[PDB]
Design a protein around this ligand. Structure first.
Ligand code: HPP
Ligand code: HPP
Ligand code: CS
Ligand code: CS
Ligand code: CS
Ligand code: CS
Lengths: 455, 455, 455, 455
């Protein structure tokens, strides 16, 4: 049911291993805000699955072969090639990370007042659309928004909302379709291949462009392989290449499924767009030949993209998350379902039924997980949603979650046990989890630096 | 006169060593544009001094100590504390490179229609200023536009122009003063400490903010020590700290004087502006704790900044460039003078008086240098100025130069000899340099991919 | 019971993951000798615990700081000072590995015809002793030769035998006492602190020198802490230091408990012997300042020794082996007991009672394990004992075992499960294990290259 | 005349750069013995050309791909292959360094009382022959012993002394011919290919075996290419492979021409010898599959051996030494001639004509070179030759030299200038160099730790 690691450990990253009593002082010193803890004081850092991947020995042999020419670097050539071969986009511009590609895609493909429609959104992506004049429309299935509904391919687009958007608004005024795989906001839910093929035939008919937010495309490809009829004899690399055939381009963040600690890229097939991309790339990132990346990082991303296609790697990655989700669900701990490709989201509202959302249950639960286990998790509730500065009132988000985001090839099943066991013991005396009040609240970006105290 | 390397070679980058006949083929495949040459086919790459520095064995040991947490990394802490110590600014936000810092500073510091005044500009910096509504005003002394005039501290601001701008336009309508150390357009020329003090006193009086474009600020420090009376007992580290004491903040590309291959940072002292910066940095670069850089890169840049302060390193850096210029001057080759900190600029109109500027003398020279020595240099003339799209006619630039830009710690004095020697023998037969016609010209960013043939 | 890894995965070694049918081909190409298998074709290599440790990110940062001077290296100084501190010996001469230390100690400490007495032997150590004229005398307690007897501190010396040797042969005719921690032939069994004190007092009385074979001395430390009354408040670092206080010097293979891939060292307190050692080390290993090791390796071994002292590391190391043994014991698989610090030994005569020891049961089992799981283990039986060349007949060894040796910090608990699970299902059909005949047998070192077929 | 480096610097090793006054305290603290100085306090360490080579970026990418299996490692396979392909020996056993191979060759190929004859000797090699019963006979040309005679191929064997040795002693009692390339003792002098072909036909006729001491075989191959008629159209790899065709095997030290910091090997074509080598390899070095080397070191040696065949690399290496020799000879500084492949030997007896050999001129000159330049050199005179412990009298060596041994790819021509210039300034006031007296003299290995004072 749960595979052993399809790799050996080559090098370890040592941890201090501080006791509960010292962890509580550390948590207090951070103001009960896990964003303020130091990296050194944390055993298992599940804050994000972004850029904290463990690289292979081959990736580190790439790291010493960094040809750092400004232009003409063999690292750029090898990255271009790999992405062309694997994803099949004609052109490819390297960027420092996913949000660097996003910035470029939104400046090049949006006319003010056009609509951008996708399957739910991701913060940096919506920002760049919106800052360029687009109106974002969510055309995800309604079922994606029910956080307990256990259905498959929950990130698919409603073709029926897709159609009415074109009828009602006009294909002309639709900038592009932003299809994301997986759907982060629904908890890392996969998009079926049928869904992607349907979306491309509808949009093609009406002349509409489709651009993929492909940050976790390889976790998506595993779901298709695991769960869609017809892909049982297909390889992950075949599924990934078919996926990108229903798209005109994509913004990718290597920090997610590329198994690197930095790097992203923009791909497109349009030669015209590509020439415009090239001029805009030099102001924001660096020349078209390196895009704000050191050569050794283009190489390591190249080797990573290829390493991610190994079935055994992506199966264990995804099933290592599911392991954690299964163990929590088995004990009755409330989570978002079905468990996604990269994280387990605890539902803090249900976990902490005694607390109201003003007493910051997700934030407080996330503080407690650190003290009990030495595991850092991230608040994804009311604190992260911010205050409405018109009214002054918090924005009250429907989802009041603590996210357990798993970096790739860093932790073992024993580390998941540590996590699961602490959360289970906490669930068993859930009523004893206190509420938090701010003792310090920033104007902007409050989740980052807010500090709190117990009520 | 000319110091020996104050280091030893730890590891080499192997090179091909292809012969003249093979290089001529390579330059032909490239369409005689040196920007299209492959990095593998080049022996000594002087395209740029950006990001191609050789790191130390301690930087590389820091490379293996990357703490890649999203937040709380030991490498962000070591970076932050190193800049605060060395440069003296209160806050520091890391960015993937210099232009990411510039984007951020210009969104935070300019109201549309205000004036931003500096000592000559750099492309990216001027773009970010103007893109945010600023009108750019060049207040460098008149003597820095004279490419042949050999005076010291050619980068200094004319205070007389700085006064008239305040008079004429008013200090409320001045966004900030953009002081660059050193000045790249004038050939990498230094700014005196007196000049920096003078500017801080005049702008202070009028409430005007002063932000440095500090990318080559340690090369500048060296000229201050070598040439300004009074700084003969001060250390490079004291010179740097004093310099930044006259600025409100700075944008910095670590790729230039921090001796790394990627990385930059915005600094400022204003708390209010720092908070605005943190919300904006998330969208463009990454969380404010990493700013688009892997942990290992924050580490290496921290260790780099600190190595850059060693007298003997910087003294050998600047004197190695000087050596190349000295050898060229002594054979009668025309160069920008006086020699800067980072590059030698050949004067290609002089070098090639038989050719008109429509016959693309600098590009042709840069093609000929590669063919004869295996060295790549950058065209900096009519080809890189671009055409006027309303007229259609070339922007015919006053300076028609070939830039020999020297990466820190990569080449030896024998390498300077290969360059010098080839450039001297071409000078001896300068009349045999043919002109070039376009055989393919791109709508935008023409210098990057234009290809040519001989007339 | 079973601790989680007290570290995180920094970098992985990618593995093939070939299927059963392909492994069977591979095992056949190997002639069913697991020593001929390729390292690429192996998933989990338990051939040996020697030199295949995963290093830390600090060891690797030390790897980039190799000062490779012939003499005066900072890495020799950091090594020397770390051993002096941790182990407490006055002098320390680095050697390329444990047996280089042994060669040196035996040339310096034995007069031909003297007796050298220890607690069971190890091949290399016994070779170097005997090659220098020594007669080897086993003074381990009688209970350690009983492979099934589960007592603690099975490595302890019988003082009664140590007394008779002194009586019978005289202390002048005793070269030195060779005390091994832990005892590899008995299955990696520990030596109590009491036993080490007892020996030091008896040998001291008689003027007899005591040199440790300390290769797994930190695994031993752990058993002392876990099991000897009185050492419950002492640290691994205090246990180690106290242990070496009962020895005159030690030969050490860093490949085993210093967590490195190469390196060893001889220690002693005698100045006279140190001077003789320095002249002899030059001929066999290198100058006394490097002893056959690159500077980077002296560095990593210094950093390794110091990491080996962390309670949680060593406690997880020893408990990971125990875990594997526990799972095997619980299904009724016969193993040497009690489980050692570094390996589990299967009892293959038991496991395979249908086969005679001429039918090569251990080798056959080791072939079958690889086929069924992808794990390599070592034959330790009749095949590795060799033949008698006067008789021609096999040396028929009392112990007929398959050793599952676990490298430090490389595999997880899921990896232990793969092994355990395969070994348990073979045990369930133990009668189907065929015997092997030689199809090629070498004159010497037969186990290394012998090949077989099935009967 | 002197080529530029055929490489770029990838990483630097920082140096402290301490002034003459502090260097003199450092020299005093070392007892005027350069063997006692620390590596950190030295600018340019010319103590030895052994193991202090700078590796390439490809070699360091090998360093991260170390497959550390005990047996079956892909690194072992790649080393075996490279050596088989390049040198052409049938079998090859890895050893920790050159003296590990020597130890094995001498145990396997000498019967007590047999003669070993070679072209002069090297310490560790003669030791291992002599310790195994051989009588060494020097059959080098007489001209090699005249240290000022500038002739080519000074390391050739006298075929006429070769013949009389067989006549007078009997081919039967000649163990093997030890042919070394280059000849270290004559100052790194080359052996012609004709000489090697002649030696093989003579020895073959009488059934006598020939084993190469090939530590600097690649510097030898350059001389043949530079100076022997007929090899102008041959490549270095062709010259090296022909060289080894006149040999039955060889001991190699990778630390010399293999461009690594550790590693050696033994090669032979005899299958019988090879089986005996295998059993003896496990006691002294480690299994036949790794020979006392970590996997990453076998890989790096593999890539190094191949990198050394680049003509441009070996030409610049050798001509970088010659540069130093030419500059010293031009000023009249007395050296051994002709300058060898790896070092310049100063003749301290002539340099210091005012001092008698009891006042230790070479030692004192070597102390002065450090104080004036920060360059460490090695005494190779009376101090290194030792005392005769029968008489108690120093052994008075004919050659009283200070050796300037150049590591490969570490220093530039500017570093050689630093060296040359300091030695020239010292020569100009040569009479002011004082004599030394011991204040501390070790029984064994005196050169290593003797300390002195000025008379
Ligand atoms: O960990 C992640 O979610 C990716 C990075 C990320 C974190 C926070 C935020 O507001 C936007 C992006
Ligand atoms: O630097 C060298 O000469 C190689 C090593 C070496 C040094 C000294 C010695 O006595 C024997 C060998
Ligand atoms: Cs990261
Ligand atoms: Cs770069
Ligand atoms: Cs090893
Ligand atoms: Cs070395």
């Amino acid at each position: 049911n749960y595979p052993a690691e399809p790799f050996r450990i080559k090098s370890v990253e040592t941890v201090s291993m501080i006791p509960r009593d010292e962890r509580l002082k550390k948590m207090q010193e951070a103001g009960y805000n896990t964003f303020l803890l130091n990296s050194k004081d944390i055993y298992i850092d599940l804050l994000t699955d972004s850029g904290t991947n463990a690289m292979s020995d081959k990736q580190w042999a790439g790291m010493m072969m960094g040809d750092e020419a400004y232009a003409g670097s063999e690292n750029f050539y090898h990255l271009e090639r790999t992405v062309q071969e694997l994803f099949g986009f004609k052109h490819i511009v390297p960027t420092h990370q996913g949000r660097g590609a996003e910035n470029l895609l939104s400046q090049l493909a949006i006319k003010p007042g056009q609509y951008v429609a996708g399957n739910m959104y991701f913060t940096t992506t919506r920002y760049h659309q919106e800052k360029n004049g687009a109106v974002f429309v969510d055309i995800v299935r309604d079922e994606a928004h029910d956080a307990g509904l256990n259905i498959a391919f929950k990130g698919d687009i409603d073709l029926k909302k897709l159609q009415k958007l074109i009828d009602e608004k006009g294909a002309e005024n639709i900038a592009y379709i932003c299809l994301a795989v997986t759907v982060n906001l629904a908890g890392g839910q996969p998009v079926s291949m049928a869904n992607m093929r349907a979306v491309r035939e509808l949009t093609a008919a009406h002349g509409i462009k489709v651009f993929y937010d492909a940050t976790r495309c390889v976790e998506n490809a595993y779901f298709i392989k695991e769960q869609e009829q017809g892909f049982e004899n297909k390889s992950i690399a075949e599924i990934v290449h078919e996926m990108f055939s229903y798209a005109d381009g994509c913004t990718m963040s290597g920090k997610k499924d590329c198994l690197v600690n930095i790097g992203g890229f923009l791909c497109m097939n349009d030669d015209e767009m590509f020439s415009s991309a090239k001029e805009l790339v030099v102001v924001y990132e660096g020349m078209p030949s390196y895009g704000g990346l050191a050569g050794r990082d283009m190489e390591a991303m190249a080797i990573g993209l290829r390493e991610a296609m190994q079935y055994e790697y992506i199966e264990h990655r995804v099933k290592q998350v599911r392991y954690l989700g299964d163990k929590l669900k088995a004990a009755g701990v409330p989570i978002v379902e079905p468990v996604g490709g990269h994280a387990v989201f605890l539902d803090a509202r249900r976990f902490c039924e005694h607390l109201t959302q003003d007493e910051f249950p997700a934030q407080s639960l996330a503080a407690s997980i650190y003290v009990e286990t030495g595991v850092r998790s991230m608040e994804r509730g009311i604190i992260s949603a911010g205050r409405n500065n018109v009214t002054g009132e918090h924005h009250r988000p429907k989802l009041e979650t603590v996210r357990l985001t798993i970096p790739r090839r860093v932790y073992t099943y024993a580390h998941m046990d540590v996590v699961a066991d602490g959360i289970i013991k906490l669930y068993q005396h859930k009523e004893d989890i206190r509420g938090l009040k701010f003792i310090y609240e920033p104007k902007q970006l409050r989740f980052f630096t807010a500090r709190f105290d117990y009520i």
